[PDB]
Structures are given as C-alpha cells and as structure tokens.
C-alpha cells in the first residue's frame, strides 16, 4: 500500500472513530504530498521525494511548537505536540541531532572526505542512512560544517 493509499485509509478510520486531531494532520500531509506533485507537474512523487515532504511537514511543526512556546501559548504548544505525535507514525524513527552528527562524522570518515570539494561524495553516501530520519536542511548543514 502506497503512502497516499495509507493516508486515505486512515482518513476514513479517523472519521469513523472520531479522531479529529489525527484526521486533520493526515489530510494536511496528504495535501502537501499532492501539492508537491502538482508543483512538479507529475502524477505522483518518487518515494524519496515523499520522504522529503514528510520531513518538511515535521520540521514546520517542530518550528511552530518552539515559536508558540516563545509566545507562551501553551494550548497551541500542546496542539502542535499532538500533531508531531501523530505525524511521527508515518516516518522512520527520527535521529536526535547528536545521533545525526555521529553519522555525519562516520560517513565523512569512511569515504575519505575532508573538504567541501568532497560534499557530493559525502551526501551520496549519507542519504541512504538518514533520509526521512532528519530534516534535509540540517543534514546538508552538518555535513558542510564538518568539511573544510
């Protein structure tokens, strides 16, 4: 079953079992996946492209939670937290920044990289290990920073 078939199935399940918070997250994520394919003018996305969208949806919410915390709107912090709890069910286990840094170092080490001229080689070797487990921005960021 594809990601979209899964989301559609869950939409029905949450409508039936009256899980409003779950339903909202599910249809919002579905829409983002559909909008990305529309942007690229194609029927659907590759599975890696879907992972990028899911990671982006997760990051947007993590960023919002922090902003609502800054604003002292704990009711909104709680709402976004619930969305994260729901969304994580559709993604592979997430890597903590420390866990990601470890992988960045491990990959740079094994492929013999040292400078940014080696970025391409490091990114190609690291993606299989981290796609969908951390936000693309952070991955590129940590790799670049560790390279001279």
Q: What is the DSSP string of 91-102?
A: SPPPPPHHHHHH
Q: Burial of 121 by CB count in 10 Å (0-12 exposed, 13-18 middle, 19+ buried)? A: middle
Closest by CA position to 3, among listed 58, 53, 40, 38: 53
On whether the CB atoms of residues 90 and 3 are closer than 8 A, the answer is yes
Q: How many CB atoms lie within 10 A of CB 96?
A: 9
Whole-angstrom distance, CA of residue 98 vs CA of residue 93: 14
Q: Burial of 2 by CB count in 10 Å (0-12 exposed, 13-18 middle, 19+ buried)? A: exposed
Q: Which two tokens stand for residue 30?
A: 């579905």
The dihedral through the CA atoms of 61, 66, 67, 71 has a sign that is: positive
Whole-angstrom distance, CA of residue 107 vs CA of residue 66: 30
Whole-angstrom distance, CA of residue 70 vs CA of residue 119: 35
In terms of residues, how long is the chain?
A: 148
Write down all domains in the chain, each with its CATH number in brackets: 1-91 (1.10.1510.10), 92-148 (1.10.10.410)
φ, ψ at 60 (rounded to 5°): -55, -40
Biggest CA pair distance of the chain? 55
């Amino acid at each position: 079953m594809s990601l979209l078939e899964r989301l559609n199935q869950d939409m029905k399940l949450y409508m039936k079992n009256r899980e409003k918070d779950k339903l909202t997250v599910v249809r919002m994520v579905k829409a983002s996946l559909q909008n990305e394919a529309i942007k690229l003018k194609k029927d659907s996305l590759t599975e890696d492209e879907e992972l990028t969208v899911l990671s982006r949806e997760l990051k947007q919410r993590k960023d919002s939670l922090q902003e609502f915390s800054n604003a002292n709107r704990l009711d909104l912090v709680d709402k976004v937290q619930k969305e994260l709890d729901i969304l994580e069910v559709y993604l592979p286990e997430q890597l903590s920044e420390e866990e990601l840094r470890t992988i960045v170092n491990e990959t740079i080490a094994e492929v013999g990289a040292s400078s940014k001229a080696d970025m391409g080689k490091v990114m190609g070797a690291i993606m299989p290990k981290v796609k969908g487990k951390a936000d693309g921005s952070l991955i590129n960021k940590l790799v670049s920073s560790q390279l001279s």
